[model samples]
Target chain A: TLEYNANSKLITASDAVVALSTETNIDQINVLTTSLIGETNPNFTPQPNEALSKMIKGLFESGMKNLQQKKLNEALKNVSLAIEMAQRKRAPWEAFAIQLPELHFMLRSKIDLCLILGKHLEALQDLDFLLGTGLIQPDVFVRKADCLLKLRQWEEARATCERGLALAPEDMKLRALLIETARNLAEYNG
Target chain B: TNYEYDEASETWPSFILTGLLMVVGPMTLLQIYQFNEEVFKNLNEEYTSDEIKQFRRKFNIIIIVGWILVAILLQRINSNDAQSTSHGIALPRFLVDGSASPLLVVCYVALLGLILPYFVSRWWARTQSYTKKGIHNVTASNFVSNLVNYKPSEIVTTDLILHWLSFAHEFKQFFPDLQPTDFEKLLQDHINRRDSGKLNNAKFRIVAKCHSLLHGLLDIACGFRNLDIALGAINTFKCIVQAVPLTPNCQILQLPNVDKEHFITKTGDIHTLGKLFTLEDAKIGEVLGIKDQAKLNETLRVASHIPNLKIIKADFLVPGRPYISLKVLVRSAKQPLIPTSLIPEENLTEPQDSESQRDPFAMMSKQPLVPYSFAPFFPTKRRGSWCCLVSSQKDGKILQTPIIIEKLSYKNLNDDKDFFDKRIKMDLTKHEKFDINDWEIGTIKIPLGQPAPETVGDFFFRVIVKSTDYFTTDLDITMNMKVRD
Candidate 1:
């Protein structure tokens, strides 16, 4: 949890990240993060700026409240302000690398909510960010494949599952998914 | 080998004892206990007689007598078995002989039951379910076997596929509208993706899960469907009539006349017949089944149209009965009970008996029900019938519909906790006189001002309430009224 004024909007996402890890399910995470979405995210208040801290706190609290209430458009508008606020920091990603995991999770909560609520296009952009950061796992691939399947992007879903199978060759779950992908291909060809 | 008389089959060691053995034939009575129930069921039901019903009750004694006669007739006709040539096979004489040991008799009883039944069981093999697990027998092929012709995996014949398809037809009624096209398509798609190395392992898994869920759903559906068939065998099932009022006023209809908008608002009651059903009330919809509140409201929005008489609403004057509450509406093509074109004197002459006038059915014979009281709105006056009373006897048989003295009253401790005044008894004789073509909905004048005829009616009433909870103190009041003539 990054420290900030109570009114600050900085993504204080350490708790959300912990919640995200414990419950890897998209829907459960959506709910876990919902309470904090438009409410102000709580953590060690960032020590750098006083007036800036107050501004961020307000936006963060508003964004979290909207997120909690599942007011998607409302939450997104406020959360975007927090995103820009972070970017305003000097050498943002580099300066933030030392404070990394929470920063990553705070943003991931936003992405997961996007996915659970079926805003796939928005969800994908955040997922792409996480993927680019070189963070990868079985569940991430599973969620990605699920999204692709829902969208009827059969080829993409199959490719995602195959990659996941490559990661864990002994994974029966991935194998089962691979089999389904094969069936889908068969159907497409027919 | 051709023997003539065979009279020497059973030697009469003693004539008197031999006669007893021949007459009593011990196995005869015992044989009937094992008789098939179907044989007698048919005997009693299909072939009737004065004694048939009695015989069904004592099929045991009846079968015993039958078996005895059969044995006696067989013996008296000079029919008996050949004697044992040697070690095993024997004539009936050896088994029935007085000199035979108990061991030999017991062995013969078991052997006849065991060894003899193999032939009969084999004869009835078509009706038997297989006890042999997995496939047991392999038919030897008459065709010369060649290694090249034996592709075991390809053994499934087109005929075998069709046979299973025929079996599947029996289960289709349960799942009803599902599993045919989508399940097939999903499985096909899953396969297509699997081939050519294009499978999405994750999405594919969900599809597989879906296939199994479909199977489970069908199994449960089939069981419930069968259970539903057997449930209604009790024709005399009784249900209690109870009613709950959702609105404080407890009135559903509005104003002096029924509005053109006849609306329906059913919640979880989507009337799908367990399949998909259209939502007809509050909202017009075909979206079936409630997963959540939002969907309920989505399909449950309200709309109205004139009702199909047979399909009209069940209106409850109370909350519900045994899980009851029903509501109904009857509208006149014209509003206000009395018509502008009517004159009271032109109508039929007054009836001789007041009881005859109260009879709804008999009144219909005199004049049909106008049903203006069931208008959309409440009557202009505080009172006028909002219901057309029909005394029906599909009427609770539980003897549960109590005989209450309905005092043109909503009296007692506001103790009408059942929440309504017993406005009129269902005797139907009461409302039969409301002349419809002439009477108005709001203003019903029974003509008390004119010289009144002497009549007796229940102006006083009684009601009973059984509450499951505590806390009631009665606040009772009584008043008197005089109808000025």
Candidate 2:
């Protein structure tokens, strides 16, 4: 008999129920795991099951497509639903990780519209909220870099870009962006 | 004679008899009674409690003296005139005639009537004397002085409250949920510390958070995202930097034209990096650097890197102060490639003679002249004349003149509608010959994005020249025109 933690027990119970009672496909299993783990432990890390993970990935890509089309309302709705579904299927951590990128990207897009319309303060609020969540990653830093740049915080923008580059060494676009940002910062400070 | 004397004595006797009949008349007695009643009625109505008591005392004394005097005088008169032709003697009639008695009564009645209404109304109109009581008990002046001493911060705190309230009212039209009252209380607390000249770090943080919250609400309502709001917030923070008092440094340096190709290329150097340079960055520096050229040049070099810099070459006038022929140039590195002039031709005609002027040695210069591959940088054609109407402050006189560039032809380019509208009509009435000494000619040298070979230029730049003082005096002395390729 194997001892399991609360999270494992929750996952096992849900998985066993699905396996013993019903004829379930991979998609169904993924959905079941996501649904089960999401409720019992929302912060629980996800273990990638190939079929379930692929399905979750497809949903995220779809969300990204919606975002690029400037269909922010639709994107937000779909992504939020997908996150909820993943959580409900006993994959809280996986849901958060997979959806976080699209969330940040959508937020950046939304902020860009605000900037174009000259709504500087509203843009700042979104940035503040995103920063407060403590879920900042390389992409988060990049988004912040652009925001700081727009704010004329050249030094801060360069610093943010540098930090982002440190996190994601292969990101060439960020590196180019940092070069210009650094130039601007030096001119202003000088 | 004896008959006439007897007739006169008879007439005297008849007059004496009629005088007796006139005294002690019935009408006189009636008037005396009416007079007493009126006086009593008036005394009852008009006099206040204390006043009525005083009046009663005075009236009693008067009555006692009057009764004694009248009795004594009447007795004395009676004794003097006893039985000696009483009919012929005349007594001073006290209450004999209607006119005399009524006149006395009228005086008494009128005095009473004037005082009575006021006395009656006073009782009915009496109010609580809280004002007087408060004044006496609280020593209001002393209380106010004490408050002033203890709460010195109140003055500015109130002002901040009022200012915020006004701002709230203005914002309320757009955001209905904005709670002015709640915000006002919060602001008052913040201002209280500020007015006390005490640095409250915690309070400051709270105030800052509140401001951020308000900004967020406004951004959402206004449909602005986070970055856009951040930009304005940062600018405001920079303005705070400018407000700090510092010693003025007197420095002057002529700024190099940032729009030049060499300058733009050099902007990527170490000196220009680490600055937030935008297209407008160069121009903003120029405007701020009118007094210092070196700082201006340095600032321009950094600004060239900004992706969105829109520079326009138009005449900007600060009325009644000074005039400059400003050439505005804008460039955006991220946008479509712009055209740059390779050949620095002094005049438009020089481009036609480029073959003879080409030199192999010229390649050593900072900007080399490429052979056939180089396109001629032709001067924009003169679209219109530059006119200026200036007024002398010393004398109420006008100095109208057309700014004449000796070798330059003045073309009336006022008809170009790309810039000025009908509201600003050109007034050429005060036009005079240009004086070179008083006017400054500014040139705008904008570097076009990368040019295509033999590609017809689709865009042409326009320049507007005008007197700076045109707005103050409502004088229209200059015209704006385009300089096309």
Candidate 3:
């Protein structure tokens, strides 16, 4: 039941195009980071287009179904497309407040899928973007450190654990991973 | 082929006897043991000493009966099979007859193997002073999973997703992982799918009921929700789980041997668990029909473990201009084994009892921390955190974002060696005057009443210490107090 399908298809191109608004048009502007979209962007146009919103929402549901069915490649395609579309639109602050958390959750799902698919660097970048939002729970740090650990970046992993521990002082999972990083560091020093 | 054709006629009586006695009977016995054992294992409930003894004894008889049946079956089979086969030259009839000795040997060996482990496990439990390490009760876990895992029909699949979306506001606060908009699009898709009459369906109704109640539960967990709504959700969920109305009166039914027929008649006017606690020792015994001294005491002990919080005193204070404070003195019996029957009747006071009301500031010493609640209905076993909310009695408008009390201390306030009149003063403010970085972990500095009440007089407000999970010990104290303008 958990087996991933190697050959899986994406959402229809026509449907995807129908959902794209001027704000969400990737052809108009090449996107770099979603960190500033919700935070620093002043003249952010809201995705008032219900069709685009519906389209993104469609992508999300499709992603979730694919996820539950363990179709990783299909899941990634849908989720990344949704994420990109959301990042491009950059809805108004009122809408962003509600949408950001949900976006973060989708990004989290994408991160998990990325990790499962052995895309560690992508997972790390997504984690940074999530943390940059500053509206995150303490467990995000643990995930960040985990990604760092997977990349064998022991020092960075330790730093992330320490940062997490500062927020949640008694997180046992963080404490244990910190200890693991310490062991690795000490072995390297010896 | 015609030389010595084996003429074997297995008659109906013999076949029936073999099927019933040799096959079904022992397997039935094993199934009985297995099914009961699985129940006992999954729940992992603490059975009383005598209850354990009784259970062990019953199973012992089952085992012994099983052994007797096996012996009888073996003998009967040996006699029945004597006419069938002859392998060796005039060996023992048991060995020569039916070529069934090895099969019977294996069956006997398997039964013998099962008996040792079963008997030894009981013996181990017996020697260990009655406590066995077992998995946590999966009742709440099962309920949570059942609600979450429930899928709507392909016709109206968005029904369940929309039900979840109903509490998206609350869910986002508690569970940070859900995407409401995605669920929105999911809903849109289902609506677009030309979905039909969903509400009229029988299965859909059940789905709606469970999901709606679960949504109500989520609503209650979030700060701004109603207590009435919360209680209805709890009561319905409890009723569904317990198969009876587990109202405060019928909560006594949770105790062993207390039946609806016996106790329901006499439990008059005891709408609260604390009221039952006020009953005299002999009256409790008569009321519940529990005569055994040890068993009665055990029942009392269990009842005492039920979460009970009381609002002793509350005051609305304006601690020198603009900054408003609502100081509440609260008492909880989560810790300290003060047996309910032993509690003084005069000392027994409900939160609403006017005579018990006093100035919270006057009674406050070093603040005693309130303990976490025992929320059995929550998926996880860990105790729930309390959120303090002060809201207007008129509009039920919450004064501020509810303050989450993460750390809880269980130090006994009544019998503390150094302290007297030790009550936890839950100090909440309308606005912050000074910026306090980190107060002591046991202490609280909850800022409440945003857009601070400038014009103030005798205003009524409800001070609620709400449990995120359990409704049992939730304290909702309403007070009409004078506030400085």
Candidate 4:
């Protein structure tokens, strides 16, 4: 692993998550991925799983670059391979997450790929994992509501809209969805 | 009636943009090359022959490349094809602000504006011109100058001649006039001197008269869009306006006599019958940072007898600085005599706070956190658009304040029924010189977006009355409003 700037570099996984939202910088972040130690302010270890981390970092970077460049199918292909590789190294979800943040990034990026490509149910399945992290953010909730609405699940969509509304009360997307959900609920009763 | 014939051009676009609107505008530069080509050809025989051609082949090729790059860059900025997941990254502050990186500005302006236009134009012109008759002349919006035929002296009349005598007293003769803006007094003085024989000293030169007459023709063209009269009246002055101030003295030329009341009709710069207003005795420095000061101030006053320039409105703004609306009023006869301009300045008007940290270098902090009714360095620009802005003191020097909204035009006051019925208390029917007694009034409105300040109180909004000539006026208001706690 690269010489971890122990005092600074690992302070927040949140920065990495935020960095993922833009059109730039996501690729730099995926390269920073490496197997790390501990639940207490965990960060990459200097020599942790050298070969394994290298493979994962390479795959993750390649996947991120592809995603940003708009080659969606190719992007999902590379990141999923990185995920499989990480699991093979005994980093299944829990073990997978604490060592390197790329596992979570991979998960989110896949969800993004799914949402944009109309794979709503598959995107919906992973929503729990992202949400449970307490860092899923308001937009994820909006996306979940979108999935439910498209699937004709009115009640679930209403709950999803409320979940997003609670975080961002002035969000117009959620506001519109709530209106859409109410209309759906009324149509059912009618 | 000695009238200073200030014949206003047809109110063509006089705004700064209008300059580029005629030439430098991207459209004008590339497309109108040929139109100017003909004129430029006759200008200098030896040089004109070397002016390349009408169509440059390089322009077409490069424009395609430039547009393709622009489209690609635009796509990258606008496309969300990459927003697969909620990475939730906040954009860099600079990117979010979109104020543009100064470097990007230099680059884009140079690439998009400078380098591109010359490259394409020079190339296309050379190639097109070299190609004989029908081979070139690429078809885009080639500027069409539809000039008809007429004489310069045909438009001149007795009343206009008399008017010219009034304003002409100081054209090549005196400095800036201190009266109700030269254009106003230009009309007023003409009437005063017409029968009064101010023309006795008027040894008028035809060139100066024609050039000045062109200005009048333009004025006529504006209100009525009488392109025919305008086209015909520009001949003698064309020589002067084109290159040479080819204006010889009256004695040198010995042109035929301009018999005042003979067959000459009143065809010069007639007064604008719109709202005529001025700030009492506006000085040059207070209104614009440029030009003479104390001289112009002598005539800036709230007095009533000064013909067109009557101070009809005081300046004030509601609690909203940027988002607030501003109002003013004035009156005029048959023409739109009231001069209008969009003025903008930081600290030009007073602020609500003044206990400013006078100096941070000496001891603690300087101008306190609070704003003031006015700033010492509030370099007021008397003429500009009306809008909302904020002023603050920072460091030892005052910083450029944030302007909430740029200038929005103030509308016609005569349109407001209240102004016409209740406040237009002046008699316009008094001026019998011409058909100028329509005497109407109107209120002007400029909405400054909103003041995003933490605190609010008596905010000072400044109002200025500035004219094309140096005549300027200044006014202030103590406005009140509410702010979030």
What are the TM-scores, per candidate, against the unseen true structure?
0.20, 0.21, 0.31, 0.22
The local distance difference test score of model 1 is 0.35
Best by TM-score: 3
Per-residue lDDT of candidate 4, residues B19-76 (tens digit): 4344434853666685001111222232211212211111155555555555555555
Error of 4 at B415 (Å): 65
Off by over 4 Å in 3: A1-190, B1-248, B254-257, B317-379, B398-401, B404-406, B413-445, B454-458, B466-474, B480-485
Best by lDDT: 3
List the candidate 4 regions with Cα displacement exceeding 4 Å: A1-47, A90-100, B1-485
> Which tens-of-lDDT digit does each residue in A76-143 have in candidate 1?
66776676775453232133443456456557767766676678877765775676565776767776
Which regions of candidate 2 are displaced past 4 Å?
A1-77, A84-140, A151-155, A165-175, A185-190, B1-485
- How do the residues B1-485 of candidate 3 rate in per-residue lDDT, one tens digit apiece? 22321334324334544555676567777879990011112222344234323433453566567567667766665667657654322233444246686887888898889988999999976566321222112323333454544332222222433444434342333336546554444333332322324311221223223443353333433343433333344444443333233344545554445756666666565444544555566787887786888778756655554444544334443433222233222333322222234333332232443432343222222444344333222212233356565556543444444455644433322222212111222232212421222111132334444444567765565656654433344554455655553
Q: Among these predicted structures, which one has the highest DockQ?
A: 2
For model 4, give the interface RMSD.
Answer: 25.7
Ranking 3 against 4 by DockQ, winner: 3
For all candidates listed, what's the TM-score of chain B alone?
0.16, 0.16, 0.39, 0.21
lDDT tens digits by residue: candidate 4, A70-178: 8878887787788887765643224434565666777887888878877877888788667755464787888888888887767557755765665466788888888
- Report lDDT (Cα) of residue A113, candidate 1: 63
Q: Which 10 consecutive positions of candidate 4 chain A have the poorest summed lDDT?
A: A30-39
